[PDB]
Short mmCIF file of C-alpha atoms in Angstrom, two decimals:
data_model
loop_
_atom_site.label_atom_id
_atom_site.label_comp_id
_atom_site.label_asym_id
_atom_site.label_seq_id
_atom_site.Cartn_x
_atom_site.Cartn_y
_atom_site.Cartn_z
CA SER A 5 -11.55 -90.64 50.82
CA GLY A 6 -12.18 -87.16 52.21
CA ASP A 7 -11.97 -85.91 48.64
CA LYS A 8 -15.33 -87.63 48.05
CA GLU A 9 -16.92 -85.15 50.46
CA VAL A 10 -19.79 -83.44 48.64
CA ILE A 11 -19.39 -79.67 48.75
CA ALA A 12 -22.51 -78.92 46.75
CA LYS A 13 -25.36 -81.12 45.56
CA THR A 14 -26.97 -80.43 42.20
CA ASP A 15 -29.41 -82.24 39.89
CA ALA A 16 -26.84 -81.73 37.09
CA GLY A 17 -24.22 -83.52 39.24
CA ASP A 18 -22.29 -82.98 42.49
CA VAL A 19 -19.20 -80.95 43.25
CA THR A 20 -16.72 -82.84 45.43
CA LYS A 21 -14.00 -81.55 47.79
CA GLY A 22 -11.37 -82.94 45.42
CA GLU A 23 -12.81 -81.03 42.47
CA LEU A 24 -12.87 -77.85 44.54
CA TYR A 25 -9.30 -78.38 45.73
CA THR A 26 -7.95 -79.09 42.21
CA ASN A 27 -9.52 -76.04 40.56
CA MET A 28 -8.70 -73.76 43.46
CA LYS A 29 -5.07 -74.74 43.12
CA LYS A 30 -4.78 -73.84 39.43
CA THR A 31 -6.40 -70.51 40.28
CA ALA A 32 -5.31 -69.41 43.74
CA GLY A 33 -2.75 -72.03 44.77
CA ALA A 34 0.32 -69.90 44.09
CA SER A 35 -0.91 -66.76 45.85
CA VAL A 36 -2.23 -68.55 48.92
CA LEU A 37 0.88 -70.75 49.20
CA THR A 38 2.85 -67.52 49.04
CA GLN A 39 0.92 -65.94 51.91
CA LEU A 40 1.03 -69.08 54.04
CA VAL A 41 4.77 -69.48 53.69
CA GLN A 42 5.52 -65.78 54.20
CA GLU A 43 3.39 -65.49 57.34
CA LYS A 44 5.13 -68.55 58.76
CA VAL A 45 8.65 -67.39 58.00
CA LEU A 46 8.01 -63.79 59.06
CA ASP A 47 6.14 -64.76 62.25
CA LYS A 48 9.22 -66.65 63.35
CA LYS A 49 11.58 -63.77 62.51
CA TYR A 50 9.59 -60.71 63.54
CA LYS A 51 7.26 -60.86 66.50
CA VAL A 52 3.81 -59.33 66.55
CA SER A 53 1.69 -59.11 69.67
CA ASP A 54 -2.07 -58.76 69.96
CA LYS A 55 -1.30 -55.24 71.22
CA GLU A 56 0.08 -54.44 67.79
CA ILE A 57 -2.67 -56.33 65.95
CA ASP A 58 -5.58 -54.46 67.53
CA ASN A 59 -4.04 -51.05 66.76
CA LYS A 60 -3.90 -51.56 62.98
CA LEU A 61 -7.31 -53.28 63.22
CA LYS A 62 -8.71 -50.08 64.72
CA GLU A 63 -7.39 -48.04 61.81
CA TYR A 64 -9.20 -50.48 59.53
CA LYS A 65 -12.65 -50.18 61.12
CA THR A 66 -12.56 -46.39 60.82
CA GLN A 67 -11.34 -46.42 57.22
CA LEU A 68 -13.81 -49.22 56.52
CA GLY A 69 -16.91 -48.45 58.60
CA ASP A 70 -20.20 -50.43 58.56
CA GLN A 71 -19.09 -52.65 55.66
CA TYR A 72 -16.81 -54.02 58.33
CA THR A 73 -19.61 -55.94 60.09
CA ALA A 74 -20.41 -57.82 56.87
CA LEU A 75 -16.83 -59.01 56.59
CA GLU A 76 -16.73 -59.85 60.30
CA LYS A 77 -19.89 -61.95 59.95
CA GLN A 78 -18.85 -63.48 56.61
CA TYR A 79 -15.21 -64.42 57.35
CA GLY A 80 -14.94 -64.41 61.13
CA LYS A 81 -13.18 -62.30 63.73
CA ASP A 82 -10.06 -64.51 63.82
CA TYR A 83 -9.51 -64.60 60.06
CA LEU A 84 -9.45 -60.79 59.91
CA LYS A 85 -6.89 -60.68 62.72
CA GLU A 86 -4.80 -63.13 60.70
CA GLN A 87 -4.87 -60.87 57.65
CA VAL A 88 -3.92 -57.87 59.75
CA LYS A 89 -1.12 -59.87 61.37
CA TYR A 90 0.14 -60.72 57.89
CA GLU A 91 0.18 -57.06 56.82
CA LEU A 92 2.00 -56.03 60.01
CA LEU A 93 4.56 -58.79 59.40
CA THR A 94 5.20 -57.79 55.78
CA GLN A 95 5.49 -54.22 57.05
CA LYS A 96 8.11 -55.16 59.63
CA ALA A 97 9.98 -57.18 57.01
CA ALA A 98 9.96 -54.16 54.68
CA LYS A 99 11.22 -51.75 57.34
CA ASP A 100 14.23 -53.97 58.10
CA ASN A 101 15.01 -54.64 54.42
CA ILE A 102 14.09 -51.36 52.67
CA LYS A 103 16.83 -48.73 52.61
CA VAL A 104 16.29 -45.17 51.34
CA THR A 105 19.42 -43.55 49.94
CA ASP A 106 20.20 -39.84 50.10
CA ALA A 107 19.57 -39.80 46.37
CA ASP A 108 16.00 -40.79 47.21
CA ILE A 109 15.79 -37.99 49.81
CA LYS A 110 17.26 -35.21 47.69
CA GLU A 111 15.10 -36.58 44.89
CA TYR A 112 12.04 -36.19 47.11
CA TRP A 113 13.14 -32.72 48.23
CA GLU A 114 13.36 -31.62 44.60
CA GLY A 115 9.76 -32.25 43.56
CA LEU A 116 8.60 -30.58 46.75
CA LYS A 117 9.52 -27.32 44.91
CA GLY A 118 6.79 -24.72 44.93
CA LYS A 119 4.75 -27.07 47.12
CA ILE A 120 3.03 -26.68 50.50
CA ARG A 121 1.43 -29.00 53.05
CA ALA A 122 -2.06 -28.33 54.48
CA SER A 123 -5.03 -29.76 56.39
CA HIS A 124 -8.72 -29.05 55.76
CA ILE A 125 -12.18 -29.55 57.24
CA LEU A 126 -14.98 -30.17 54.75
CA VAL A 127 -18.61 -29.40 55.65
CA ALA A 128 -21.97 -28.65 53.99
CA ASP A 129 -23.23 -25.31 55.38
CA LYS A 130 -21.48 -22.00 55.97
CA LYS A 131 -23.04 -21.96 59.43
CA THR A 132 -21.60 -25.42 60.11
CA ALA A 133 -18.22 -23.98 59.19
CA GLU A 134 -18.70 -21.00 61.51
CA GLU A 135 -19.67 -23.47 64.24
CA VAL A 136 -16.32 -25.16 63.71
CA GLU A 137 -14.56 -21.82 63.33
CA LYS A 138 -15.85 -20.92 66.80
CA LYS A 139 -14.87 -24.27 68.31
CA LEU A 140 -11.34 -23.62 67.04
CA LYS A 141 -11.14 -20.16 68.59
CA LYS A 142 -12.44 -21.56 71.90
CA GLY A 143 -9.35 -23.79 71.80
CA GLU A 144 -10.46 -27.13 70.36
CA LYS A 145 -7.75 -28.79 68.23
CA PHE A 146 -7.99 -28.87 64.41
CA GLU A 147 -7.31 -32.61 64.11
CA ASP A 148 -10.02 -33.43 66.64
CA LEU A 149 -12.58 -31.25 64.87
CA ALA A 150 -11.76 -32.70 61.48
CA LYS A 151 -12.50 -36.17 62.85
CA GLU A 152 -15.80 -34.87 64.22
CA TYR A 153 -17.01 -32.71 61.32
CA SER A 154 -15.07 -33.22 58.09
CA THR A 155 -16.80 -35.06 55.25
CA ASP A 156 -13.55 -35.85 53.43
CA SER A 157 -11.46 -39.03 53.59
CA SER A 158 -8.72 -37.08 55.40
CA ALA A 159 -11.08 -36.73 58.37
CA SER A 160 -9.51 -39.73 60.15
CA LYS A 161 -6.07 -38.31 59.39
CA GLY A 162 -6.93 -35.14 61.30
CA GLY A 163 -7.67 -33.46 57.98
CA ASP A 164 -4.15 -33.75 56.51
CA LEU A 165 -3.87 -33.46 52.71
CA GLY A 166 -0.13 -34.01 52.43
CA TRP A 167 1.91 -31.95 49.93
CA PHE A 168 0.48 -30.29 46.83
CA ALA A 169 1.37 -27.47 44.43
CA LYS A 170 -0.76 -24.45 43.48
CA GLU A 171 -1.08 -25.36 39.84
CA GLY A 172 -2.86 -28.69 39.99
CA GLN A 173 -3.29 -31.64 42.34
CA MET A 174 -6.41 -29.83 43.66
CA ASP A 175 -9.29 -27.45 42.91
CA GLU A 176 -8.17 -23.95 41.90
CA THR A 177 -10.56 -22.37 44.39
CA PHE A 178 -9.05 -24.33 47.26
CA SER A 179 -5.35 -24.26 46.39
CA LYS A 180 -5.32 -20.55 45.56
CA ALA A 181 -6.80 -19.92 49.00
CA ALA A 182 -4.43 -22.39 50.65
CA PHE A 183 -1.37 -20.86 49.02
CA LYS A 184 -2.54 -17.40 50.09
CA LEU A 185 -2.14 -18.52 53.71
CA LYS A 186 0.82 -18.07 56.05
CA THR A 187 2.40 -21.06 57.80
CA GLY A 188 0.38 -22.12 60.82
CA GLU A 189 -2.46 -19.83 59.79
CA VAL A 190 -6.03 -21.11 59.53
CA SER A 191 -8.42 -19.73 56.94
CA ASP A 192 -11.99 -18.49 57.05
CA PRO A 193 -14.70 -20.66 55.43
CA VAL A 194 -13.82 -21.32 51.77
CA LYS A 195 -16.75 -22.09 49.47
CA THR A 196 -16.12 -24.71 46.76
CA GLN A 197 -17.83 -27.44 44.77
CA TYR A 198 -17.51 -29.92 47.62
CA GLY A 199 -18.74 -27.44 50.24
CA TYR A 200 -17.04 -25.17 52.79
CA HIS A 201 -13.43 -25.55 53.84
CA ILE A 202 -11.39 -24.54 56.83
CA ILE A 203 -7.78 -24.74 55.68
CA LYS A 204 -4.68 -24.83 57.84
CA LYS A 205 -1.37 -24.35 56.06
CA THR A 206 0.99 -26.63 57.96
CA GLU A 207 4.42 -25.81 56.64
CA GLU A 208 6.44 -24.14 53.96
CA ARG A 209 8.97 -26.17 52.08
CA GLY A 210 12.35 -24.54 52.37
CA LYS A 211 15.72 -26.11 53.04
CA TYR A 212 17.44 -29.50 52.56
CA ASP A 213 19.82 -30.66 55.35
CA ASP A 214 17.46 -28.85 57.74
CA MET A 215 14.58 -30.88 56.38
CA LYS A 216 16.54 -34.03 55.56
CA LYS A 217 15.45 -36.33 58.38
CA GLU A 218 11.71 -35.67 58.10
CA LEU A 219 11.81 -36.28 54.36
CA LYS A 220 13.64 -39.57 54.88
CA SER A 221 10.77 -40.64 57.13
CA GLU A 222 8.31 -39.55 54.43
CA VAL A 223 10.15 -41.43 51.67
CA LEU A 224 10.06 -44.59 53.74
CA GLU A 225 6.35 -44.24 54.47
CA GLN A 226 5.83 -43.81 50.75
CA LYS A 227 7.77 -46.97 49.89
CA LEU A 228 5.76 -48.80 52.55
CA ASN A 229 2.47 -48.09 50.73
CA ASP A 230 3.78 -49.51 47.45
CA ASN A 231 3.05 -53.22 47.68
CA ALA A 232 5.61 -54.05 45.00
CA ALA A 233 8.28 -52.48 47.20
CA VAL A 234 7.07 -54.47 50.21
CA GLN A 235 7.07 -57.82 48.37
CA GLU A 236 10.45 -56.97 46.90
CA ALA A 237 11.62 -56.66 50.50
CA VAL A 238 9.78 -59.74 51.78
CA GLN A 239 11.19 -61.87 48.95
CA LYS A 240 14.72 -61.17 50.18
CA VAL A 241 13.77 -62.73 53.50
CA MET A 242 12.20 -65.69 51.73
CA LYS A 243 15.36 -66.54 49.76
CA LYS A 244 17.47 -66.52 52.93
CA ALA A 245 15.04 -69.15 54.23
CA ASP A 246 15.10 -72.69 52.86
CA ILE A 247 11.75 -73.09 51.14
CA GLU A 248 11.19 -76.37 49.36
CA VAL A 249 7.93 -76.84 47.46
CA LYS A 250 7.14 -80.54 47.27
CA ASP A 251 4.09 -80.14 45.04
CA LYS A 252 5.17 -80.19 41.39
CA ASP A 253 2.23 -78.13 40.14
CA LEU A 254 3.20 -75.21 42.36
CA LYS A 255 6.97 -75.51 42.21
CA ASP A 256 8.80 -72.36 41.18
CA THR A 257 6.27 -70.41 43.25
CA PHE A 258 9.21 -69.06 45.29
CA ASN A 259 12.06 -70.17 43.08
CA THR A 260 12.44 -66.97 41.13
CA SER A 261 11.27 -63.42 41.87
CA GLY B 6 -4.35 -87.23 52.72
CA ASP B 7 -4.73 -83.65 53.92
CA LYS B 8 -1.55 -84.08 56.00
CA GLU B 9 0.40 -84.28 52.71
CA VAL B 10 3.24 -81.72 52.71
CA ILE B 11 2.93 -79.06 49.99
CA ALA B 12 5.90 -76.96 51.09
CA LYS B 13 8.71 -77.55 53.57
CA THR B 14 10.03 -74.58 55.60
CA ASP B 15 12.46 -74.02 58.46
CA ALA B 16 9.43 -72.53 60.25
CA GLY B 17 7.20 -75.57 59.63
CA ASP B 18 5.47 -77.24 56.69
CA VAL B 19 2.38 -76.25 54.71
CA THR B 20 -0.04 -79.16 54.43
CA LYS B 21 -2.64 -79.92 51.79
CA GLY B 22 -5.39 -79.49 54.36
CA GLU B 23 -4.03 -76.11 55.44
CA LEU B 24 -3.81 -75.04 51.81
CA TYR B 25 -7.27 -76.34 51.05
CA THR B 26 -8.63 -74.41 54.00
CA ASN B 27 -7.03 -71.07 53.15
CA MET B 28 -7.91 -71.22 49.47
CA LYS B 29 -11.53 -71.92 50.51
CA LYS B 30 -11.72 -68.66 52.44
CA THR B 31 -10.40 -66.55 49.55
CA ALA B 32 -11.51 -68.30 46.37
CA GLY B 33 -13.98 -70.99 47.48
CA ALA B 34 -17.15 -69.15 46.57
CA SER B 35 -15.90 -68.00 43.16
CA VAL B 36 -14.49 -71.37 42.09
CA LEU B 37 -17.49 -73.31 43.41
CA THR B 38 -19.67 -70.93 41.40
CA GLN B 39 -17.86 -71.79 38.15
CA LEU B 40 -17.83 -75.54 38.88
CA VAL B 41 -21.59 -75.56 39.47
CA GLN B 42 -22.32 -73.38 36.45
CA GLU B 43 -20.15 -75.46 34.10
CA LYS B 44 -22.04 -78.59 35.23
CA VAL B 45 -25.52 -77.08 34.89
CA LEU B 46 -24.90 -75.26 31.60
CA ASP B 47 -23.13 -78.24 30.02
CA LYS B 48 -26.26 -80.25 30.84
CA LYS B 49 -28.44 -77.76 28.97
CA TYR B 50 -26.18 -76.40 26.23
CA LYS B 51 -23.79 -78.39 24.04
CA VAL B 52 -20.57 -76.98 22.60
CA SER B 53 -18.82 -78.45 19.58
CA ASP B 54 -15.09 -78.93 19.29
CA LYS B 55 -15.17 -76.59 16.30
CA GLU B 56 -16.68 -73.80 18.40
CA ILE B 57 -14.00 -74.40 21.04
CA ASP B 58 -11.16 -74.42 18.47
CA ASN B 59 -12.48 -71.26 16.81
CA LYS B 60 -12.37 -69.36 20.11
CA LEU B 61 -9.09 -71.06 20.94
CA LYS B 62 -7.57 -69.76 17.71
CA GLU B 63 -8.84 -66.21 18.34
CA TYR B 64 -7.10 -66.24 21.72
CA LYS B 65 -3.78 -67.35 20.19
CA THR B 66 -3.93 -64.41 17.80
CA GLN B 67 -5.12 -61.82 20.34
CA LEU B 68 -2.38 -62.97 22.71
CA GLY B 69 0.51 -63.72 20.41
CA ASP B 70 3.44 -65.36 22.16
CA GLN B 71 1.69 -64.72 25.51
CA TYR B 72 -0.52 -67.73 24.65
CA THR B 73 2.22 -70.35 24.60
CA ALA B 74 3.24 -69.12 28.06
CA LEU B 75 -0.27 -69.71 29.43
CA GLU B 76 -0.25 -73.00 27.50
CA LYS B 77 2.87 -74.00 29.43
CA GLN B 78 1.62 -72.87 32.83
CA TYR B 79 -1.85 -74.39 32.65
CA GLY B 80 -1.86 -76.96 29.81
CA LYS B 81 -3.91 -77.24 26.61
CA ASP B 82 -6.69 -79.26 28.23
CA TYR B 83 -7.27 -76.70 30.97
CA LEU B 84 -7.28 -73.90 28.40
CA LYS B 85 -9.88 -75.64 26.23
CA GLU B 86 -11.86 -76.29 29.39
CA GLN B 87 -11.93 -72.57 30.24
CA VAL B 88 -12.85 -71.78 26.66
CA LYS B 89 -15.71 -74.31 26.86
CA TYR B 90 -16.90 -72.59 30.05
CA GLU B 91 -16.91 -69.21 28.33
CA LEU B 92 -18.85 -70.51 25.34
CA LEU B 93 -21.41 -72.08 27.67
CA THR B 94 -21.94 -68.83 29.61
CA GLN B 95 -22.29 -67.03 26.28
CA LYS B 96 -24.99 -69.35 24.96
CA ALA B 97 -27.02 -69.09 28.16
CA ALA B 98 -26.64 -65.31 28.28
CA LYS B 99 -27.75 -65.02 24.63
CA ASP B 100 -30.96 -66.87 25.45
CA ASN B 101 -31.66 -65.11 28.73
CA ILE B 102 -30.52 -61.50 28.42
CA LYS B 103 -33.53 -59.32 27.74
CA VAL B 104 -32.95 -55.99 26.07
CA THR B 105 -35.61 -53.45 26.96
CA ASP B 106 -36.64 -50.40 24.94
CA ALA B 107 -35.02 -48.28 27.64
CA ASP B 108 -31.78 -50.19 27.00
CA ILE B 109 -32.02 -49.33 23.32
CA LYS B 110 -33.01 -45.66 23.61
CA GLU B 111 -30.21 -45.11 26.09
CA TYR B 112 -27.93 -46.80 23.57
CA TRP B 113 -29.20 -44.51 20.81
CA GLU B 114 -28.73 -41.44 23.02
CA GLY B 115 -25.14 -42.62 23.43
CA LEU B 116 -24.52 -42.54 19.68
CA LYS B 117 -25.37 -38.84 19.67
CA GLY B 118 -22.51 -37.19 17.80
CA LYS B 119 -20.76 -40.51 17.15
CA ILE B 120 -19.88 -42.13 13.84
CA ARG B 121 -19.37 -45.67 12.63
CA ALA B 122 -16.30 -46.53 10.57
CA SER B 123 -14.24 -49.32 9.09
CA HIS B 124 -10.51 -49.15 8.54
CA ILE B 125 -7.71 -51.02 6.79
CA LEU B 126 -4.44 -50.78 8.68
CA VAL B 127 -1.15 -51.56 6.99
CA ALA B 128 2.49 -51.05 7.91
CA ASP B 129 3.85 -49.25 4.85
CA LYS B 130 2.29 -46.53 2.63
CA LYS B 131 3.14 -48.52 -0.50
CA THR B 132 0.70 -51.13 0.71
CA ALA B 133 -1.91 -48.43 1.38
CA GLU B 134 -1.64 -47.01 -2.12
CA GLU B 135 -2.10 -50.49 -3.56
CA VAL B 136 -5.43 -50.85 -1.70
CA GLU B 137 -6.63 -47.37 -2.69
CA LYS B 138 -6.14 -48.19 -6.35
CA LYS B 139 -7.94 -51.55 -6.09
CA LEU B 140 -10.91 -49.85 -4.40
CA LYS B 141 -11.50 -47.54 -7.37
CA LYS B 142 -11.72 -50.63 -9.58
CA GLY B 143 -14.79 -51.57 -7.51
CA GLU B 144 -13.46 -54.06 -4.96
CA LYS B 145 -15.25 -54.29 -1.61
CA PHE B 146 -13.84 -52.51 1.42
CA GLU B 147 -14.64 -55.40 3.73
CA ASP B 148 -12.92 -57.82 1.34
CA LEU B 149 -9.80 -55.68 1.13
CA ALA B 150 -9.76 -55.35 4.91
CA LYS B 151 -9.66 -59.14 5.21
CA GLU B 152 -6.82 -59.34 2.69
CA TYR B 153 -4.55 -56.46 3.77
CA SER B 154 -5.52 -55.29 7.25
CA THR B 155 -3.16 -56.04 10.12
CA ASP B 156 -5.59 -54.93 12.82
CA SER B 157 -7.87 -57.35 14.69
CA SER B 158 -10.79 -55.76 12.86
CA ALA B 159 -9.80 -57.46 9.60
CA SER B 160 -12.34 -60.19 10.34
CA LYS B 161 -15.22 -57.73 10.81
CA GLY B 162 -14.45 -56.22 7.40
CA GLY B 163 -12.55 -53.46 9.17
CA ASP B 164 -15.46 -52.26 11.30
CA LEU B 165 -14.47 -50.27 14.39
CA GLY B 166 -18.00 -49.70 15.64
CA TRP B 167 -19.10 -46.33 16.96
CA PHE B 168 -16.77 -43.79 18.53
CA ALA B 169 -16.66 -40.22 19.80
CA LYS B 170 -14.28 -37.41 18.94
CA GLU B 171 -12.27 -38.10 22.09
CA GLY B 172 -9.58 -40.03 20.23
CA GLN B 173 -10.44 -43.60 21.16
CA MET B 174 -7.76 -45.17 18.92
CA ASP B 175 -5.74 -42.02 18.24
CA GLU B 176 -6.38 -38.29 18.02
CA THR B 177 -4.76 -38.25 14.57
CA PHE B 178 -7.11 -41.06 13.54
CA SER B 179 -10.33 -39.61 14.93
CA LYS B 180 -9.52 -36.17 13.51
CA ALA B 181 -8.90 -37.62 10.06
CA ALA B 182 -11.99 -39.79 10.56
CA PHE B 183 -14.65 -37.21 11.50
CA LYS B 184 -13.64 -35.20 8.42
CA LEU B 185 -15.46 -37.76 6.22
CA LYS B 186 -19.06 -38.19 5.00
CA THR B 187 -21.05 -41.43 4.79
CA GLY B 188 -19.60 -43.54 1.97
CA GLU B 189 -16.47 -41.40 1.73
CA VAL B 190 -13.15 -43.28 2.02
CA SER B 191 -9.93 -41.48 3.02
CA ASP B 192 -6.25 -41.58 1.99
CA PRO B 193 -3.41 -43.04 4.17
CA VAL B 194 -3.11 -41.64 7.70
CA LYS B 195 0.32 -42.06 9.36
CA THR B 196 0.07 -43.11 12.99
CA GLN B 197 1.84 -45.25 15.58
CA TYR B 198 0.10 -48.41 14.30
CA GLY B 199 0.83 -47.82 10.62
CA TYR B 200 -1.08 -46.29 7.72
CA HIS B 201 -4.90 -46.27 7.90
CA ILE B 202 -7.57 -46.16 5.21
CA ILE B 203 -10.80 -45.11 6.94
CA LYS B 204 -14.36 -45.47 5.57
CA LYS B 205 -17.27 -43.93 7.48
CA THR B 206 -20.21 -46.35 7.41
CA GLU B 207 -22.86 -44.45 9.43
CA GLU B 208 -24.30 -41.33 11.00
CA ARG B 209 -26.85 -41.43 13.87
CA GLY B 210 -30.31 -41.20 12.30
CA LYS B 211 -33.84 -41.50 13.67
CA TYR B 212 -34.60 -43.77 16.60
CA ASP B 213 -37.45 -45.53 14.78
CA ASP B 214 -35.41 -46.45 11.70
CA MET B 215 -32.52 -47.68 13.85
CA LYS B 216 -34.56 -49.33 16.62
CA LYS B 217 -34.50 -52.96 15.42
CA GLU B 218 -30.85 -52.81 14.29
CA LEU B 219 -29.69 -51.34 17.61
CA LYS B 220 -31.28 -54.12 19.65
CA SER B 221 -28.65 -56.58 18.42
CA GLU B 222 -25.89 -54.05 19.12
CA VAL B 223 -27.09 -53.52 22.68
CA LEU B 224 -27.18 -57.29 23.22
CA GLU B 225 -23.63 -57.62 21.92
CA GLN B 226 -22.61 -54.91 24.39
CA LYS B 227 -24.17 -56.72 27.33
CA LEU B 228 -22.46 -59.95 26.24
CA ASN B 229 -19.10 -58.25 26.84
CA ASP B 230 -20.30 -57.19 30.28
CA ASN B 231 -19.64 -60.02 32.73
CA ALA B 232 -22.21 -58.65 35.20
CA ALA B 233 -24.90 -58.95 32.54
CA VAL B 234 -23.74 -62.43 31.55
CA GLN B 235 -23.62 -63.81 35.10
CA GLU B 236 -27.00 -62.25 35.84
CA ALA B 237 -28.47 -64.03 32.80
CA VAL B 238 -26.63 -67.24 33.66
CA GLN B 239 -28.19 -67.08 37.10
CA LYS B 240 -31.66 -67.10 35.51
CA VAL B 241 -30.75 -70.53 34.12
CA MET B 242 -29.46 -71.50 37.56
CA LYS B 243 -32.87 -70.61 39.01
CA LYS B 244 -34.40 -73.61 37.23
CA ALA B 245 -31.79 -75.98 38.78
CA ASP B 246 -31.58 -77.23 42.37
CA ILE B 247 -28.29 -76.12 43.96
CA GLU B 248 -27.78 -77.28 47.55
CA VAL B 249 -24.46 -76.34 49.13
CA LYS B 250 -23.71 -78.77 51.95
CA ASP B 251 -20.50 -77.02 53.10
CA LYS B 252 -20.89 -74.85 56.21
CA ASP B 253 -18.41 -72.11 55.26
CA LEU B 254 -19.85 -71.72 51.75
CA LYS B 255 -23.57 -71.93 52.60
CA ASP B 256 -24.47 -68.44 51.31
CA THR B 257 -22.54 -68.72 48.04
CA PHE B 258 -25.67 -68.59 45.86
CA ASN B 259 -27.88 -66.64 48.30
CA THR B 260 -27.31 -63.30 46.51
CA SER B 261 -28.68 -60.10 48.09
#
């Protein structure tokens, strides 16, 4: 049969398709069956267009530059699209099925205490920083310049660092300087271990009820980057579907979760 | 054949062929690599059922109760098979890993300020005081470790190998431990794991006196590094003729 197809020839004996299939199944059968079934069920429920696919694909090339071409050559252009489509589907499933309570929001608000949000631009030389300082004053936007100049991972994100307190969660040279700032204010070059920083304090923390709706959006984005929370959501969709595994070895793949 | 239905769904079925295809993209290279290696190595090296059982027993103990779960999911035969594969990769790596003098001097430089110690761990302090009293009669520490110790180190005579002051087992343990001299054995140390009797076996001496002894230690270190093992295994693979006929998996052995 087709299982007799020789995958690899060796002087110590051949590896057949059947051998490959059997051992793959003990190893990866459950996880791949899971993905296959979920992308089928979700693709029928939620709808994802190539418009949507390319957008999250773009975010992936930037985050993963140069190494990208190796994956594109190794796996293929279509297979990557498929993986992206799967993520977008599981994301859509999670948005419809995840619910953040007000306990979660007030819980997020408290924990934002004594915290501030800020962006930064990381560079090597003090003259490079003054180059950027001048481009700012001329009117260029901070987010744009961070993408052009910043060495840090936040460079794609327009330099955003999210929330952080003064105590820890950062270098004391940076955070002291950041916390010294006023809201909306941009700093002068700040020398640190990593280099020179231009910091922009984005917002102070204050009040709940005023701040409620933005924090809800933040809580949700946070639950969307926890894959356990996503799969917890996706699995609800999978139960409501009638999945029947006919292969005994992989039964119970979806039965309980 | 490949049109066999693995899973039925309201959104369409998953076939064997589809499943075969999508596993191949994720896990094909890695599983093909093991299949080829277990064929080639089994042709060269031979593993006895006793060696397999010995490692099988060690895994039962290390994973108490968690073993019988894996035994249920996979089966005894598959487990022995994986154990046989491990033993094969070990034998090949033993023969092919080469420890350089740079490997050893870097290892020696890493023992700077470290100590070697054995311990006997027990649950209750009444048990600890029984062992202390037997020691003074002249009984061997390693023997008493084998008899009383609850820790996995009981088989090595209680040996914990080298460690720094940064509490690797426990900060209460390492503090009590560094307080000792070579040959000195301590009294019971209460911790989360139980009561410990610690005996410091070594200080870091000269490189020349330690050189030959350290070589075996370095090798044992590289045997617990899978990168070092697979690199050595691949030296054995060099002497064999692997020809992958599958288009998608052509570059599986063509390492950079």
